[PDB]
Amino acid sequence: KVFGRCELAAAMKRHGLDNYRGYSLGNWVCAAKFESNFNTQATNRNTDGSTDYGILQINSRWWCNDGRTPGSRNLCNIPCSALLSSDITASVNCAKKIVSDGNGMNAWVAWRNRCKGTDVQAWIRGCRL
Structure with a gap:
């Protein structure tokens, strides 16, 4: 599924990500934007044989099993x-x-390069949360 920005913001809010471990909602929406462009089926092969999966591009080397x-x-x-x-x-x-x-959100290089320190509220503006 491909989420529209506000749709995702609402789902993330319902799941308790707003200010989770010190990171406001926008940080999570921003991370999702640059990792998968809000697509739940995004996959990406890595040189070491691992693959990143889903909306937050979670890696199979440590976090999930892909066999x-x-x-x-x-x-x-x-x-x-x-x-x-x-x-x-x-x-x-x-x-x-x-x-x-x-690690905080440093696991996501895209977050670190494109989101960290910027005006993250931009990612939740216009949404009715």
Whole structure:
């Protein structure tokens, strides 16, 4: 599924991402925009054999199991396919765990380059939340 910006903002808000671990809603919407362009089915092969999955491009080397990333870890305890759903529950739950594993939102380079420090409220303006 491909979400419109405000549609995603509402879903993320309902799932408790607003100010989660210190990151306001816009940060999450912005991250989604630059990682997958709001597409739940985005996948991306990496040189090391891993693949990034879903709306937040969660990696199979540590977080989910896809059966094809030799010597990886499944820390979200989830098949990577659960991350390609229309229902972002699986993606959101796993992202909450990644952000808690020390790093903050630094796991997403696109967030660090395109969102961090900017006016993130722009991503939620015009939406009725």
